[model samples]
Target: ASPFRLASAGEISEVQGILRTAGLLGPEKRIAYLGVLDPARGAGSEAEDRRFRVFIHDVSGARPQEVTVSVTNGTVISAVELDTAATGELPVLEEEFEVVEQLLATDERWLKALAARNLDVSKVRVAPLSAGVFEYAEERGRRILRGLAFVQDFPEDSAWAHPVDGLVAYVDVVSKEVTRVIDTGVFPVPAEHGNYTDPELTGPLRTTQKPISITQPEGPSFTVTGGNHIEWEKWSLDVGFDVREGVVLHNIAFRDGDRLRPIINRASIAEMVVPYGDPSPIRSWQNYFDTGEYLVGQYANSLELGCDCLGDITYLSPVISDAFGNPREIRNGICMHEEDWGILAKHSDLWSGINYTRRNRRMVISFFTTIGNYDYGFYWYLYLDGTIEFEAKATGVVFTSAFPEGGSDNISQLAPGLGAPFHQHIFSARLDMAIDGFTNRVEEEDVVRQTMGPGNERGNAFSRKRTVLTRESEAVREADARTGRTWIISNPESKNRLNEPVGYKLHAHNQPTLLADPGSSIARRAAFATKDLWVTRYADDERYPTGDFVNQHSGGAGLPSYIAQDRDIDGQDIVVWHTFGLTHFPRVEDWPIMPVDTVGFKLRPEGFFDRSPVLDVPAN
Candidate 1:
């Protein structure tokens, strides 16, 4: 015999008879689902088994309560309450109920409204014993009910009525008696929010002491000459003062790298400037400058003009030189944006809102370029001494180290066992120089360094090696500035080595004076000084295994602090340090061509500038 069985006509009759006795089924109640199964698997077996579960929610009150029922054969097995009352006792349904009498006694406004709408009153029905709850079916056989409202009337045109919360149902003109109410919870209405406004600022402006500008006028294109060293092939350098705007916009361009080509690529411009004097004034200036009005004012107050790299092409050349007499060749090629290019594209907004105190000034220009699917990083430095330094960093290389097969549990251990492995083996950077703010003369140099061997190491034997570059070389200048001065410098070469851990250090020459003057105003002001900053690669996301990247063998880490309780630099009284790496993307577009990446700090003046130097500026 089959495990499943069909219910016989007699069995169905018996169930209906029982339901009628319990007042659960009227002659019109329709059957939804019915099935049966053999009590035993084989004919010889005689054991009987049966089970069924049912769930219902009574939405008649302020809150709905779920009721569960279990049954075996025709007997009730168990009935359980699954919800509790939030405040007082739960309401109970009364058995005795006269639908007509109850409708007459209740407020008739809702009924009259429905009647005026031509709904049929005869079709209205209430839940057996619930006063506020009503139910009906539509022609399509959909059932609906009003949980917290009583049905008032059923006019010819409308089939159902809800008094408290408005109409709950409507009947099909074709199906005279059935009514249906649509549930709105499953598809909720959307809520709306207001706009956001930026905060205001009140303070004196701060300025930097050693301000400098770096220019690459020929074209925004450069090349990796030796091993991993970088050199500029053709570029333009220009500097001009905008008296009306009270700000100077210097522009430069280079032509040499395929990755640096500025077509259809987003650019991120970052500047690193050495600060002199006290850090307090610098921080104060940053705060004042970030104000909404200040940023807008700066944008309007700035004027920009410069050269163009209109028909520049970037190609990889094998041989290039560095400032230190090192012989290097172009490992990669790049073509960059010309003067005022970003401004014309309305992209110079990224560098607005400049504010500084009388202490810090030397600035560096960092520009990013993406071509095809890869991004190439490059930068030029402007020092207080009017010297310029250019460098480029690549992103396609992967740094790896070996970990013991079973020792993967400890990531730190893998660092010690890393070795040179055969792969793309290319890791290098380049620097191009223009001395004494002379745009006419320029010098280029390259530094190519790579890993060599995988000598025997114990435990989890592995080697740490990077793509090696031969030597460094220098390039001669071919241009002069409008000032009639040749801005070019003699090419020099230097042997540069790749350093591990990728960290920067801070050392103070007046340590003794700083330590002894702890109680001094200047000393107290310097307590929260930002000594050093660096960046590293690490992974973080919104999924399980939180902090997994920190535990990974190849993950990198960095720590930064700000002089505020909150960690974000864009906001006041906030200071935060973040580690980011291995961005996960769902599409290929995001690959090869990764998004612009940045890691840095924001500092608050703290108590050092609690009281604005110019109190009359305005306080909010």
Candidate 2:
């Protein structure tokens, strides 16, 4: 098996034993994340380098720790406790989510705040939220989750519809106590219901839309081997799942004749931060690192057979360890299938009177996770035309709050007194690209209009100007839709028939980056969202964009710290972090449930092949 293969249930248990025997793990220390280590970290081949990378949260010391243990060799490689002050707090445990709910039930201050709003404490649902970094004395160096109150009067009621505004509770998980409570006056809870799922609440259901059945008569176009490695047409990759990133694609390659060309070594949505635009004290500390603070994969939705996916879908149920080091399998954690993509190419010869066209299709490997009020689906598309596209779909109930009748600039009026605040879902994708090989260089391409002085005497000449990003410091850039800006990652060791370096071009959607103030806590902690692209020297340890610990993190970590070395990147093995996302100002229609808003980027073959790879497609 390759080193990129996901750790099995037995392998997880064996690794846990090795850590227990080595005195690296204890009852007080819970496993935060455990995954297979890169081959470079070991001393042997892929099969021999069977060491598992483990991140265990030491509840006794109230810190996060990393340990490497070789299950094959039965030896502990290395172990170290990360400095909590420097790295910030670890991801919230699966068990820690319940602590705040319990705290709200017993705390008199929290109950009083709910009483002031004329809300019953039992009917109110408590949300365990990320306590963003601030100068508050009580929150410093504490394992805290800011608790938010929502009214769920009934069992099937939409809790997000009725928010108890202007109340915040700081609950320290380590101490299992509510440290402080802030109540900035009470506001009217929305009287309208948001239970769109309930037919009674919704009044009626639509019957006009007919059932669309997607049937693959023969079977799917893809095949799954070893339960993880997938092969479809020219694309072949291993699907791995992580506790934070959810679905991860590893060792992605496209078959070109007899040669399997490497495209990406590893890729995943490394981190995403949702920062609310409102500056009210209740929302000023509203930035949430979905991947880093709260593990997204922990909330993976068990996909339905026909509803969630259609047409001969294959699901990979990945096994993940719980907070107590017990392995639990999330059934149907990933879905793999193919979808009709309309057209590949079409042309009609002017003189010959003949038309030729080919149908286009794409392989989709996707997974959906529901984090509180919002649900996100990460879709990886592989086209026959040698195009790789990643789309992140954001849908579900909008996070709502009570506001004044007209609403403020930062709030979009949904109902009478309900408003959904403006926020940005900024996602950072870590692309460990290989292009054609490992030694590669990055180049920024922009279409430039030539001046009419010398080359462009007609005043209509324009050409693409390419600039090589030779170092880490020079690689930080933003997407420019006006200039048709794109990035090329080229392998210096390989060349196409035109003598051009084999490469893939990155095309971004050019959405706005982080909207927070430059000096704000969110802008500092989530520094990666400030730009569209960033390149860094490839290191085994540099996996996350917001460092390892993102909960209540201080500044000066993650991308800001990685690029500080300013290492040379040209002709070196490097990683590219692309920041692309959606900046949403909620509309009235987005009240109960927001429609699927998509944001993605495409990676197309740019001189990587001799010509258009789909020319040989047979006309059915």
Candidate 3:
């Protein structure tokens, strides 16, 4: 069995059974997540590499527990109860939504508030969210889900369009009760329906658009082994699914000549936050940690052909554990397909009367998730020209609020009475690089123009200045658009033909980091997003950008805490964390449904390749 293989349903169930039998898990506890734990660096035992990490969430005290088990040996390797009260809290469980709905159904205060708005309790949908840290007396040190009610005209109607504004319910998970209710005031719900799919509401389908069909008669170019291991073209990587982070690519390597050169050891969109800019009473606590607080993979959309994906596609049904420790499969959880890129190479030599052109293709590994009103599609592309690009497609219904008659500062008038809040979707990607081998260093390359001197008499000469970030603190950087800055991860041990260190350059989007004020809770909790790039010393447990528990995190626990020691990073095993995304101020066109806003980073071989790797491609 491959060590990078995702834990199978049988393995997950077996491991859960072992943990439960060991008295480490009980009925009051549930498996928050279960995945194959990568063996420590330079681990020797094959059995050790196959071990699974089972993260348990104890509902009794909202305690997070971790247990590592070897299914082959049928024994638990290690177990620990995490003290998350000081750090953060576990994700709001899937099962907790049902309990919250039930509790709201019987709560006199919640029902009274709904009645005050002349809304039927049956037509209302209560979104159970992570009650962020606010230092509230009743919510402090308590596991709770902040319930935000939305009204739906019909069962299939969009509830997001009709939010029951200004009313919030804090439900204590352990007590199974609504501990507090914040009723700022009642506002008129947006009357317009936000259903984009309904023909009546959408008016008419666009008949001018034609269907574009994609097919590969010879089937796909990629091959999969043992389910998760994929090999396509010169690229090979292992696909892993976590309940929180969703799609994770491990052991990404590209074949150069006869050597399978390792590039990134593991890569994943570790954490993301949607911090709304509005500071109103109802919107003040609107910063939502989609990956940390709510499990993204758990709400993944099962894709369909002709709609979600086209061309020759292979679907992977990753096994995930439920709150009750049941192993379930998200059918078509991951979609693997190939797309024809524009062109690999093209040239026309007038002197020789010769023209050459080569077609380009890329393998795409993608998955979609619906976190409340937003739908995110993560697409990872491996190009024929030795490049890796990750694009996050953010589309779906824009979360709306009632458009105040007297316009508000942070609300964008999407419709007459519907407003979309100004918010930013910031995603942090953890890239563990094994460029050539593990010993790699990062160098900041910024373009600089030479002054009018001996080398630049015309004041037209320009060159790149490389600065080595030898320590962790020196690596915490922001993207400078004016200077055209990029980070190069190079290996001193591996040199190119020119006797220079081979490297891959990172091209990042110079978007604004966290827009919240420094003193805000989200600013502290999501401190990782404050910078564009961070290089940290490799640690097995430092998988997440935000600390493990982020539900109601008090802050200063994740990347900020990880780099506090400012460890040495030069020529050592290091992981690079890139915070890149969009700062969106919703336009009127973003109403009802928003078009996919694409943003991400690219990794291109600088001196890593001896020359153009795609030169062997045939003219087509």
Candidate 4:
């Protein structure tokens, strides 16, 4: 019998054994996710062979050492140490939650802050946090970290249920001490707002209604191979976990009558930055680069059947590691299913007795990640009509900062007391487009109005102007809703019957970039979000939009530096970066818990087929 395997707790032993043989796996070695990587590259990548990767850091010496290794067949293929790991690594871990609890449980300063506000330390919960900023932090042997506090047993699973208000702790793991505390001496008791799940809220809620069943009499229209590769009628893709990017898809392709056509090579949530609008030092530092600073896969919640999803779902458990380097499966971290997407299209003709109605079946793979008080759900959908959806939804308890017992901030529309503040969730995805084959050209398309020029005498007429952008640096642009400013990546050599380029367009709703000033500290670290769209020459080394090392780093990394390379993009391999965002201002209705807020764009075929690609789609 053949074997099926890749990651187990013991899988890391290959790298550990190599490090030991090379005398690099002793004490003080912090092991990280050199454990997970993109399977699209490397040896046997085209053969579907099993592989493992890991990178580690040694903190016991004066000179920081990084050991990078890859394992296969329980054997080390390559092990090398560089001054710095080019891919970078995250130093935060789930076990650190336990570490912070232990430290704050014994701290006198934290206890007094609770007592000063007439709160009990027993009911006070320490929410260990990892917001990267150099001012509220100090560098130590191994980490640069910050801290936060929430209320325990406050109504429900909502950690934002009740904040300790103005109290925050700064922790140093290596030093084994609480370096500092930010306590404004005000514990504006968070209103015990039941569960943010809101199934039981009364102020405006509920009814005993009949259960609605989502059923598939003929069964799902999708199948899978090896539990991870998905195949629908015309779509095929492979999905995996990135520990931070949540659910990622690779080698996504579509069918063109007789042959499979290449669409996207790889796609994933590359970076997300949620900047709190509060201006105070205690609140202003609330900006979080979710993917860059935290392992989103680690926070993926186990989805409930008939609850989170419906109608026969296939679950893909993620293989993850712990603080000390041990593989563990997060069961049901990803769910794949097919659903009836309402009426796909309907048309009627009174004459000649002709009417047609069709229902759409979409193949969807989804996963959820909870960051502190907010929960983010990601779904990648493939439709029979050759449309790809990259969707992100935000729900759960809002992340709240401290306000005085009687004060309020209009900037956030916060309650007089314990109100959750305003913050914007920004997400960017890197997609490698292989329109027909690997080589594709990128061009900007703008729908412009003609003011009675020689081209158009009618002042009311408008036309589109397409401009081919040959360089990557100039491809950076903002969305224009008025004229449908679209970034079009096309295969010039492959055309439809009318000779139009085979292509797809990427457009956001044109949400303004980050509200942070251009020169602000937060803006510099997240320059990728400055423009809604960025196209770069496809380089395997550049994955994360904010660069590989996003933790507490100053601005000179990520898209800013990558674009500095100023490579020519022209008619060659390329990657398109789209920033999906929101300009959120919290409302009173958003209190307690918020409903889902989804943002994304679709990639639809543009002049890729002679006629409708789904014209032959079977009607349900």
Query: Which numbered prediction scores highest in lDDT against the true structure?
Result: 2
Q: Of the candidates numbered 3 and 4, which has the greater lDDT value?
A: 3
lDDT, each prediction: 0.23, 0.87, 0.86, 0.72
Residue by residue across 516-606, what tens digits does model 4's lDDT show?
8787878888888888888888887788888766765666688878887888888888888888788787766666677788788888778
Task: Give the alpha carbon lDDT tens digit for every residue of 240-294 in model 1.
Answer: 1110111111323233223221110001111111111212210111110011101
Cα error of candidate 3 at position 367, Å: 0.5
TM-score of 4: 0.90
Off by over 4 Å in 3: 44-48, 62-64
- Tell me the lDDT of model 4 at 322: 56
lDDT for 529 (candidate 2): 97
* Steric overlap count per candidate: 99, 0, 0, 3
Residue pairs that clash (backbone atoms under 3 angstroms), model 4:
34-53, 34-54, 34-55
| Candidate 1 off by > 4 Å | 1-334, 339-376, 380-394, 402-530, 533-620
Clashes of 1: 99
For model 3, state the Cα shift of residue 245 in Å: 1.4
Model 3, span 1-620: residue lDDT tens = 67777778888788778987998777788777667777689865664546887778877775678788888889989988777766666677777777877888899988888888999899888877777888686676677887778888998888888878788887887788888778888888778787888988788777898888789888998999998888988888999888888999999999999999999998999999999998777767888899988878889989998788887889998888877667888998789998999978889999999998999999999999998778999999999999999999999988777778889889888876777789999999999999999999999999987788886788888888999999887889999999999999999999999999999999998888898899998888899989999999999889888887788878778898888879999999999999998999999888788888999999999899899998877765
